[PDB]
Design an enzyme around this catalytic site. Structure first.
Site, PDB file in Angstrom:
ATOM      1  N   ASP A 144      -8.316  -7.368  -0.504  1.00  0.00           N
ATOM      2  CA  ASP A 144      -7.017  -6.721  -0.789  1.00  0.00           C
ATOM      3  C   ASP A 144      -7.126  -5.992  -2.150  1.00  0.00           C
ATOM      4  O   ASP A 144      -7.289  -6.673  -3.125  1.00  0.00           O
ATOM      5  CB  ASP A 144      -5.854  -7.708  -0.860  1.00  0.00           C
ATOM      6  CG  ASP A 144      -4.471  -7.062  -0.928  1.00  0.00           C
ATOM      7  OD1 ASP A 144      -4.342  -5.965  -0.415  1.00  0.00           O
ATOM      8  OD2 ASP A 144      -3.556  -7.668  -1.458  1.00  0.00           O
ATOM      9  N   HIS A 216      -3.273  -1.893  10.356  1.00  0.00           N
ATOM     10  CA  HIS A 216      -2.584  -1.886   9.046  1.00  0.00           C
ATOM     11  C   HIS A 216      -2.782  -0.536   8.338  1.00  0.00           C
ATOM     12  O   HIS A 216      -1.842   0.055   7.963  1.00  0.00           O
ATOM     13  CB  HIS A 216      -3.092  -3.021   8.178  1.00  0.00           C
ATOM     14  CG  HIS A 216      -2.344  -3.088   6.897  1.00  0.00           C
ATOM     15  ND1 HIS A 216      -1.015  -2.954   6.798  1.00  0.00           N
ATOM     16  CD2 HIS A 216      -2.727  -3.222   5.637  1.00  0.00           C
ATOM     17  CE1 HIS A 216      -0.627  -3.049   5.569  1.00  0.00           C
ATOM     18  NE2 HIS A 216      -1.611  -3.150   4.891  1.00  0.00           N
TER      19      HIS A 216
HETATM   20  C1  HEM Z   1       0.615  -9.754   4.814  1.00  0.00           C
HETATM   21  C2  HEM Z   1       0.831  -8.709   4.048  1.00  0.00           C
HETATM   22  C3  HEM Z   1      -0.222  -7.765   3.694  1.00  0.00           C
HETATM   23  C4  HEM Z   1      -1.588  -7.937   3.720  1.00  0.00           C
HETATM   24  C5  HEM Z   1      -2.388  -9.174   4.027  1.00  0.00           C
HETATM   25  C6  HEM Z   1      -2.134  -6.670   3.380  1.00  0.00           C
HETATM   26  C7  HEM Z   1      -3.504  -6.486   3.315  1.00  0.00           C
HETATM   27  C8  HEM Z   1      -4.126  -5.294   3.035  1.00  0.00           C
HETATM   28  C9  HEM Z   1      -5.530  -5.037   3.121  1.00  0.00           C
HETATM   29  C10 HEM Z   1      -6.633  -5.965   3.512  1.00  0.00           C
HETATM   30  C11 HEM Z   1      -5.718  -3.744   2.763  1.00  0.00           C
HETATM   31  C12 HEM Z   1      -7.037  -3.032   2.778  1.00  0.00           C
HETATM   32  C13 HEM Z   1      -7.842  -2.936   1.495  1.00  0.00           C
HETATM   33  C14 HEM Z   1      -7.069  -2.068   0.568  1.00  0.00           C
HETATM   34  O1  HEM Z   1      -6.277  -2.572  -0.233  1.00  0.00           O
HETATM   35  O2  HEM Z   1      -7.216  -0.859   0.427  1.00  0.00           O
HETATM   36  C15 HEM Z   1      -4.423  -3.197   2.499  1.00  0.00           C
HETATM   37  C16 HEM Z   1      -4.185  -1.894   2.132  1.00  0.00           C
HETATM   38  C17 HEM Z   1      -2.935  -1.370   1.863  1.00  0.00           C
HETATM   39  N1  HEM Z   1      -1.764  -1.977   2.039  1.00  0.00           N
HETATM   40 FE1  HEM Z   1      -1.491  -3.759   2.718  1.00  0.00          FE
HETATM   41  N2  HEM Z   1      -1.174  -5.794   3.172  1.00  0.00           N
HETATM   42  C18 HEM Z   1      -0.008  -6.327   3.384  1.00  0.00           C
HETATM   43  C19 HEM Z   1       1.240  -5.776   3.229  1.00  0.00           C
HETATM   44  C20 HEM Z   1       1.505  -4.517   2.779  1.00  0.00           C
HETATM   45  C21 HEM Z   1       2.792  -3.943   2.602  1.00  0.00           C
HETATM   46  C22 HEM Z   1       4.088  -4.647   2.854  1.00  0.00           C
HETATM   47  C23 HEM Z   1       2.579  -2.665   2.122  1.00  0.00           C
HETATM   48  C24 HEM Z   1       3.536  -1.601   1.812  1.00  0.00           C
HETATM   49  C25 HEM Z   1       4.773  -1.605   2.198  1.00  0.00           C
HETATM   50  C26 HEM Z   1       1.165  -2.464   2.088  1.00  0.00           C
HETATM   51  C27 HEM Z   1       0.540  -1.329   1.657  1.00  0.00           C
HETATM   52  C28 HEM Z   1      -0.827  -1.116   1.629  1.00  0.00           C
HETATM   53  C29 HEM Z   1      -1.451   0.162   1.129  1.00  0.00           C
HETATM   54  C30 HEM Z   1      -0.767   1.422   0.662  1.00  0.00           C
HETATM   55  C31 HEM Z   1      -2.781   0.008   1.331  1.00  0.00           C
HETATM   56  C32 HEM Z   1      -3.911   0.997   1.041  1.00  0.00           C
HETATM   57  C33 HEM Z   1      -4.072   1.926   2.256  1.00  0.00           C
HETATM   58  C34 HEM Z   1      -5.109   3.047   2.128  1.00  0.00           C
HETATM   59  O3  HEM Z   1      -4.774   4.088   1.601  1.00  0.00           O
HETATM   60  O4  HEM Z   1      -6.261   2.897   2.495  1.00  0.00           O
HETATM   61  N3  HEM Z   1       0.589  -3.588   2.516  1.00  0.00           N
HETATM   62  N4  HEM Z   1      -3.503  -4.166   2.666  1.00  0.00           N
END
Ligand code: HEM
Ligand code: MG
Length: 301
Positions: A144, A216
């Site tokens: 993350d 996601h």
């Molecule tokens: C259980 C809740 C969540 C988990 C486990 C989770 C997990 C992750 C993981 C594994 C990544 C990929 C690695 C990275 O950070 O680039 C990611 C990316 C991201 N997450 Fe989440 N996330 C969650 C909730 C959220 C929420 C609620 C938002 C926004 C409302 C969000 C926004 C993002 C964004 C903007 C990225 C980067 C996307 C990109 O441009 O590649 N996430 N998240």
């Protein structure tokens, strides 16, 4: 004649954090002096523990911020809506305190100072102790933070309001997720990877045309004419091994719009499809807050 950002927005790789969410019990005027005392305490703790690289943020809900500001600025601020007609619940409170550093012990002393400053004017609804897990992984086993804005310059561009009355301020979104790791472990590692949009062990991006639209990354990597809707995430794992555990989601943005578009996408409001992570984890809280600049916390009174 410029504005200073609150210390807890921009820091990167902090290994520990404390989030306190609370409701106002008494007069809104009690928050004016308490906030000035707290930002003073944060400066005192930074002087005593320079190697902690301590930062903190005090942010306010719509109702109390409209009263404190007299209705000026914070044009996008509103109570957090329910998204997906219920899939994302709403638990909008009046005050958010976010503390982060390299030392949990220092965060705990800072949390006690926050409670002493606000006193019985607040009713604490949530207190979550965040911790960076092995390889900066979410408890699901996926890294993350990889595409999170990097460096002070880009993080200021994404998170910090540039001009006008709110210059130096930011919009905050908090949402606590409860993971069902037993349900995740039933999934094959390739099915988990299609659910996230990145490989598990190596943390490689799966191409957009190879991964499902419900993945996601497909839900939250949004562009408007080629310009990404970026946010500064400060989320961390939390909980006990035998009890409730998951991810305390936290994000800062100069525009609340970027966060809202990602939530509309994730919870089915944009195209009727929802985030595949809902097969193993669910949000149980939700709130929007406005983090004013440091000098506007001193101008309260
Ligand atoms: C259980 C809740 C969540 C988990 C486990 C989770 C997990 C992750 C993981 C594994 C990544 C990929 C690695 C990275 O950070 O680039 C990611 C990316 C991201 N997450 Fe989440 N996330 C969650 C909730 C959220 C929420 C609620 C938002 C926004 C409302 C969000 C926004 C993002 C964004 C903007 C990225 C980067 C996307 C990109 O441009 O590649 N996430 N998240
Ligand atoms: Mg991308």
């Amino acid at each position: 004649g410029m504005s200073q950002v609150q210390s807890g927005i921009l820091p990167e790789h902090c290994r520990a954090a404390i989030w306190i969410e609370a409701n106002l019990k008494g007069d809104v005027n009690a928050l004016r002096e308490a906030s000035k005392i707290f930002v003073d305490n944060v400066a005192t703790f930074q002087a005593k523990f320079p190697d902690a690289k301590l930062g903190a943020v005090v942010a306010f809900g719509n109702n109390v911020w409209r009263q404190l500001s007299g209705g000026e600025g914070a044009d996008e601020l509103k109570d957090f809506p329910v998204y997906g007609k219920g899939l994302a619940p709403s638990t909008q409170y009046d005050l958010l305190i976010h503390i982060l550093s390299a030392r949990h012990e220092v965060n705990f002393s800072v949390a006690q100072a926050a409670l002493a400053a606000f006193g019985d004017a607040i009713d604490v609804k949530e207190e979550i102790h965040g911790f960076r897990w092995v390889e900066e992984r979410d408890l699901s086993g996926f890294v993350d933070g990889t595409e999170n804005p990097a460096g002070e310059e880009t993080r200021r561009e994404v998170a910090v309001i540039k001009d006008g009355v709110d210059a130096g301020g930011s919009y905050v979104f908090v949402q606590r997720w409860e993971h069902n790791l037993k349900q995740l472990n039933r999934m094959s590692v390739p099915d988990q990877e299609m659910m996230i949009g990145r490989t598990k062990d190596a943390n490689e991006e799966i191409d957009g045309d190879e991964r499902p639209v419900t993945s996601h990354l497909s839900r939250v990597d949004l562009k408007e004419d080629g310009k990404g809707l970026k946010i500064v995430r400060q989320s961390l794992p939390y909980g006990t091994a035998s009890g409730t555990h998951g991810l305390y989601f936290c994000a800062y943005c100069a525009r609340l719009y970027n966060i809202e578009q990602q939530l509309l996408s994730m919870f089915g409001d944009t195209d009727g499809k929802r985030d595949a992570m809902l097969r193993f984890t669910k949000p149980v809280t939700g709130g929007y807050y406005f983090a004013p600049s440091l000098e506007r916390i001193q101008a309260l009174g």
